[PDB]
Coordinates of C-alpha atoms in Angstrom, one line a residue:
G1 CA -112.1 -1.9 50.7
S2 CA -112.7 0.6 47.9
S3 CA -112.9 4.4 47.6
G4 CA -113.1 7.1 44.9
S5 CA -115.0 10.3 44.4
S6 CA -115.8 12.2 41.1
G7 CA -114.9 15.5 42.7
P8 CA -116.4 19.0 43.1
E9 CA -117.5 21.1 40.1
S10 CA -119.0 24.5 39.3
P11 CA -120.7 26.3 36.3
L12 CA -119.3 29.1 34.3
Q13 CA -115.9 27.4 34.8
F14 CA -113.6 30.3 35.0
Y15 CA -110.0 30.4 36.4
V16 CA -108.2 33.7 37.0
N17 CA -104.5 34.1 37.7
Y18 CA -102.7 36.8 39.7
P19 CA -99.6 38.8 38.6
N20 CA -98.0 38.3 42.0
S21 CA -96.5 35.0 40.7
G22 CA -95.1 35.4 37.2
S23 CA -91.9 33.8 36.0
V24 CA -90.5 32.5 32.7
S25 CA -88.4 29.3 32.3
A26 CA -86.8 27.5 29.4
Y27 CA -86.0 23.8 28.8
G28 CA -85.4 21.4 26.0
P29 CA -82.7 19.3 24.2
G30 CA -81.6 22.5 22.6
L31 CA -80.5 24.3 25.7
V32 CA -78.9 21.2 27.4
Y33 CA -76.8 20.1 24.4
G34 CA -76.6 19.8 20.7
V35 CA -74.7 18.6 17.6
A36 CA -72.5 20.6 15.2
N37 CA -74.5 21.5 12.1
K38 CA -77.6 19.9 13.6
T39 CA -81.2 21.1 14.1
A40 CA -81.8 22.1 17.7
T41 CA -84.8 23.7 19.3
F42 CA -86.3 24.3 22.8
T43 CA -89.5 25.4 24.4
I44 CA -90.2 28.3 26.8
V45 CA -92.9 28.5 29.5
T46 CA -94.9 31.7 29.7
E47 CA -98.6 32.3 30.5
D48 CA -100.2 35.6 31.2
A49 CA -96.8 37.1 31.7
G50 CA -97.4 40.4 29.9
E51 CA -97.0 41.5 26.3
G52 CA -93.7 43.3 26.7
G53 CA -90.7 42.2 24.6
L54 CA -88.8 38.9 24.5
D55 CA -85.1 39.1 23.5
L56 CA -82.9 36.1 22.6
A57 CA -79.2 36.0 22.0
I58 CA -76.7 33.2 22.0
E59 CA -72.9 33.4 22.0
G60 CA -69.9 31.1 21.7
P61 CA -67.0 30.1 19.5
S62 CA -69.1 30.8 16.5
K63 CA -72.0 33.1 15.7
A64 CA -75.3 31.2 15.4
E65 CA -78.6 32.4 13.8
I66 CA -81.9 32.5 15.6
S67 CA -85.4 32.3 14.2
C68 CA -87.4 32.5 17.5
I69 CA -91.2 32.0 16.9
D70 CA -94.1 33.5 18.8
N71 CA -97.1 31.1 19.3
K72 CA -100.5 31.6 20.9
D73 CA -101.1 28.1 22.3
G74 CA -99.1 28.1 25.6
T75 CA -95.4 28.2 24.9
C76 CA -92.9 29.6 22.3
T77 CA -90.8 27.8 19.8
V78 CA -87.2 28.8 19.0
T79 CA -85.2 27.0 16.4
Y80 CA -81.5 27.4 15.7
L81 CA -78.5 25.7 14.1
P82 CA -75.0 25.7 15.5
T83 CA -71.9 26.1 13.3
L84 CA -69.1 24.7 15.6
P85 CA -69.0 22.4 18.7
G86 CA -68.4 24.1 22.0
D87 CA -69.9 25.7 25.1
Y88 CA -72.5 28.2 23.9
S89 CA -73.4 31.1 26.2
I90 CA -77.2 31.4 25.8
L91 CA -78.7 34.7 26.9
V92 CA -82.4 35.4 27.4
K93 CA -84.0 38.6 28.7
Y94 CA -87.6 39.4 29.6
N95 CA -89.0 42.9 29.8
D96 CA -85.5 44.2 30.5
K97 CA -85.0 41.5 33.1
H98 CA -82.9 38.3 32.7
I99 CA -84.6 35.0 33.4
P100 CA -84.0 33.0 36.6
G101 CA -81.4 30.5 35.7
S102 CA -79.4 32.2 32.9
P103 CA -77.0 32.4 31.5
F104 CA -77.4 28.7 30.4
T105 CA -74.6 26.4 29.5
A106 CA -75.0 23.7 26.8
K107 CA -72.6 20.9 25.8
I108 CA -72.4 20.6 22.1
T109 CA -70.3 18.0 20.2
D110 CA -69.4 17.0 16.7
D111 CA -70.2 13.8 14.9
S112 CA -68.8 13.5 11.4
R113 CA -66.8 10.3 11.3
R114 CA -69.1 7.3 10.7
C115 CA -68.4 5.0 13.6

């Protein structure tokens, strides 16, 4: 036996989204964990959310700098570099409304000695 269909299709291919369902999430090896004095970045999901105002701020045992970047492809790119190993309290807000899942907890370590 064998089966398989190409599938339906229509012209003026146009897909519209509704505001009803609109949420922003964040994931990546930069929010889960990291390495002292090591490059760490993560990605953020956001499509047709609304040009409002994204704010990012991380806390912990040491103040870390943030160079969040705004892209126009599909997701944003935020790069940062830790100063000391420890649980960093990442905080992200969207249009005066925290994101579903925050604050986030990342487990960063330190690798200096050459094992």
